Homo-oligomer: A and B are copies of this chain.
Amino acid sequence: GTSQWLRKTVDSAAVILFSKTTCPYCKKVKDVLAEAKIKHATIELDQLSNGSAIQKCLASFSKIETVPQMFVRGKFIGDSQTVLKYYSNDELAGIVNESKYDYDLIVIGGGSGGLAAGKEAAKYGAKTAVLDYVEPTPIGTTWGLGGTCVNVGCIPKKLMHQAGLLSHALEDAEHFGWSLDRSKISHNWSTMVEGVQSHIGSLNWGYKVALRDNQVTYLNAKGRLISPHEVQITDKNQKVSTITGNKIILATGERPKYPEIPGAVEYGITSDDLFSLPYFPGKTLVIGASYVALECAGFLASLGGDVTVMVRSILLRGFDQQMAEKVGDYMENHGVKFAKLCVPDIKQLKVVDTENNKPGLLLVKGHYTDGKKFEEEFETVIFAVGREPQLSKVLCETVGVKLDKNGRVVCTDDEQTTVSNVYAIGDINAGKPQLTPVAIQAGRYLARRLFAGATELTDYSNVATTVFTPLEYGACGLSEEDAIEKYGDKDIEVYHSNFKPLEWTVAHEDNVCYMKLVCRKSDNMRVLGLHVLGPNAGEITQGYAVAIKMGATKADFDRTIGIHPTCSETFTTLHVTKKSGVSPIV
C-alpha cells in the first residue's frame, strides 16, 4: 500500500518536500524556500513508521533514496545541490510556477465548504482560485461572500433567536429583582436587522481579506464546468472567458424551493429574503414544518409577531418524533398558532411600502384534510418547503459527473466524483448531513489529501445537531424509532427524565424540559442516540458527541460525576426506563 500512496501523493501535490527533521541539507532547502516565499507541503520521514520504505519508493521517481527530495506538480525537481542551483541562477521561481493549467485548484462556490477548502489548499503551495456568485431572489435580494450560513443561514438566524430569547430574559429580570416592566417595552425590527447586517458585512469583508492574505484569487463570477479541466466564467458585466485548473471542487450549495401555486413566487418570500428584510413582517404565515420553518416562526413570535405555521402532515420529518412533538407543543403554548393537516392553494391585497418600510397584505386560500376551507389575511407569507441544488446551471452534462435522483453529486468516501480530478463537498454531496461544520471538515481534510499527502477521511457518522427553536433541541445519533427498526424492540432500552433549569425556579414550567438515552442491550448498553430539550441545548450536546464517537456506554455515563448546578448534569444520573412504565416527571 505504501507504493500506491506515494504515487498518488507525488502526482497531485503542487509543491512538496520530503525531509527529515534532523538533516542539515533539508534545513538549507527550507531556508531557501522560506526566503523566496515559496509555500509548500513537507513530509518528515523520520516521524512515520514506514518512513524507511517511503525513502526507497521515492527512487521510482527520482532515482535517489536520500533526503531532501523536492517535487513540483508530479515532477522531481532536485536534491539540495540542484535546488540551490536553480535559486542561484534566478531559475527557481519559474520552475515552481510552471503548470499546464492556470490554477492547481479552482473552487466553484464561495461558501462554508469552498472557502475552507481554498484557504487550506493555498497553504501548501496550490495556486488557487475561488469563484462565488449569488443569483438574486425573485424580489431581487443578494448578498456578499461567505455562502448560506454566513449571509442567510446559521449566523443571522441564531442572532435573531438571541433577540427572541432576550424577550424572556426581560420578563425573568422582574422576578430576579430588576425594576423594569416588560409589558411597556417593545421591539424595533429594523434596528435589529441593521446590527445583524453590520456583523454579516464584517464577515463578507473578513473573507475577502483572508483570501488575499493567502494569495488566493477571488473572482466574483458565475462558474460553469464545461470539460474536466475548463471552467467558463461570466462576470458582472456579462463578459465570458475561460480558465483552466488541475483539480476542481464543486461547492455550490442549494437554494429554497417554492410550491407550484398561483402567487407564490410573486407575493411570498423565503429565508433568503427574511434576514435582510427592510420592514417588520407583521402578521405572518409560515408554510412548512422543517427546522428552518420552526426556527423562523419561533423568533418572529418572541419579537411580538402574530405568527401561524401551516403543517401539511408532521413536524421535523426525519427527526425523533417524540422530541419533535415536544418542540411543537412548547411553541403552541408560547404564542405560535398551528394550522394542522392543511395545504395552500396567494392573492395580493396591498403592495409592500418601500418608502415608509411597511409590509403589504395578502389573502391565503387553502384547505384542510377534513374538507374545511382555509382563508385568512397575512402581512407576510414565508415558504419553508425545502431546498435543492441547481447543478445544470453549474455542470455541463457532457463532462460525465454522475448525479442522483435529487440532483446531488454521487461521490466516493473521499469526495471524488465520477470524473477523477473533480470533487464535491457540502450540501451538494449526496447522502451527507447538510451542516456547516461538516462542509468545513470535508473541505479542509480534502485539501490536505490533495496537496499535502494526507490520508484522513471525514467521518460523517453520529454528527450532532441542534434546532434553535424557542426551547432548543439537541441530538446525537439515532432517533428512538430508527434504533428500534434497526435492532428490534427487545434489544433497545431507553433511559429518560424531565428536568427544570434552576434559572426557571425564581422566574416561575416544571416538567417540560426532557432528555433521553437510547441504548443497545446486547452491546454493553452502548449509547446509540442522545436527545435533550432545554436551554443552551447545543452547548449541552457538543461534548457528549466526543464520547459517543468513542463508543460510550450507559456505564460510562454513570461513572462520570456531574457539575452542579447545571442542566447537563442530569445525563449523569439517569435511571428510569421506558419499559418500566415509571413516570419521568420530577
Contact = CB atoms under 8 A, between A and B. Distances in A.
Contact of A199 (B178, B437, B505, B539): B505
Contact of A166 (B167, B176, B186, B191): B176
Contact of A503 (B162, B178, B559, B568): B162
A465 interface: yes
Main secondary structure of the interface of A (DSSP, over half): helix
- Which 8 A-B pairs have CB atoms at the shortest separation, nearest pair first? A543-B543, A177-B192, A542-B568, A543-B544, A546-B547, A163-B176, A437-B562, A538-B566
Contacts of A503: 159, 162
B539 A159 contact: no
21 contacts: A159-B506, A162-B506, A167-B178, A170-B170, A175-B195, A176-B192, A176-B195, A177-B189, A178-B186, A179-B185, A179-B186, A536-B536, A539-B540, A541-B543, A542-B569, A543-B544, A543-B545, A544-B546, A545-B563, A547-B552, A549-B559
B178 A561 contact: no
A561 B556 CA distance: 21
A200 to B, nearest CB: 10
A510 to B, nearest CB: 11
Interface of A: 149, 154-155, 158-159, 162-163, 166-167, 169-170, 172-173, 175-180, 185-189, 191-192, 195-196, 199, 303, 435-438, 441, 459, 463-466, 474, 502-503, 505-506, 536, 538-547, 549-550, 552, 556-557, 559-569, 571-572
Nearest to A173: B166
Contacts of A560: 545-546, 549
Contacts of A303: 177
A463 B539 contact: no
A187 B178 contact: yes
Contacts of A544: 543, 546
B568 A543 contact: yes
Contact of A564 (B154, B459, B563, B569): B154
A132 to B, nearest CB: 20
B180 A180 contact: yes
B563 A464 contact: yes
Nearest to A172: B166
A49 to B, nearest CB: 14
Nearest to A570: B542
B177 A170 contact: no
Most buried by B among A187, A543, A565: A543
B502 A561 contact: no
A563 B572 CA distance: 21
Nearest to A112: B564
Nearest to A188: B177
Contacts of A173: 166, 169-170
Most buried by B among A180, A563, A567: A563
A177 B169 contact: no
Contacts of A563: 437, 464-466, 474, 538, 541-542, 545
A119 B292 CA distance: 46
A149 B502 CA distance: 13
A474 to B, nearest CB: 7
B506 A199 contact: yes
A503 B567 CA distance: 20
A62 to B, nearest CB: 31
A467 to B, nearest CB: 11
Contacts of A186: 178-179
B172 A178 contact: no
A546 B538 contact: no
A550 B547 contact: yes
Given A542-B566, A550-B552, 6 more contacts: A435-B561, A437-B572, A466-B566, A539-B567, A543-B568, A547-B550
